[PDB]
From Swiss-Prot:
Annotated localization: Nucleus
Disulfide-linked positions: none
Protein name per Swiss-Prot or TrEMBL: PR domain zinc finger protein 10
Domain remarks: The SET domain is degenerated, suggesting that it has lost methyltransferase activity.
Disease cited in the entry: Birt-Hogg-Dube syndrome 2: A form of Birt-Hogg-Dube syndrome, a rare genodermatosis usually manifesting in adulthood and characterized by multiple fibrofolliculomas, trichodiscomas, and acrochordons. Patients with this syndrome have an increased susceptibility to develop renal cell carcinoma, lung cysts, and spontaneous pneumothorax. BHD2 inheritance is autosomal dominant.
Top-level taxon: Eukaryota
Species for this entry: Homo sapiens
């Protein structure tokens, strides 16, 4: 009766809150349970860069900027895809401390993909 070693995941994948999961087939982060309005995730963690040489896999975030390319160097927020209309958006991103956060603007339901875009004031900085 074997019991295998537990698979070790990239930093980005393991730093994910137990409240959420990434869905293999669909792409992106979802909620296991109800996530109420005004729930704050973060901080975004990862390498900082210039805006010069920043990729298109991701939303762009000013703090210098975040390069969210590499799972071994970022945390789970690298997986949170950028919303493309107001229908699908349920997070807003802003700077608060020395840090950047994603905050729910809707009560998010189970099996709904979390999708981010700028809070208006933050949209000014970027």
């Amino acid at each position: 009766h074997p019991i295998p070693n537990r698979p070790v995941l990239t930093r980005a994948r393991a730093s994910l809150p137990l409240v959420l999961y990434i869905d293999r087939f669909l792409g992106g982060v979802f909620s296991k349970r109800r996530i109420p309005k005004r729930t704050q995730f973060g901080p975004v963690e990862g390498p900082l860069v210039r805006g010069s040489e920043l990729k298109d896999c991701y939303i762009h975030l000013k703090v210098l900027w975040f390069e969210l390319s590499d799972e071994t160097l970022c945390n789970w927020m690298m997986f949170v895809r950028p919303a493309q209309n107001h229908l699908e958006q349920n997070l807003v991103a802003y700077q608060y401390g020395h840090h950047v956060y994603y905050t729910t603007i809707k009560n998010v339901e189970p099996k709904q993909e979390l999708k981010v875009w700028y809070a208006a004031s933050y949209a000014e900085f970027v």
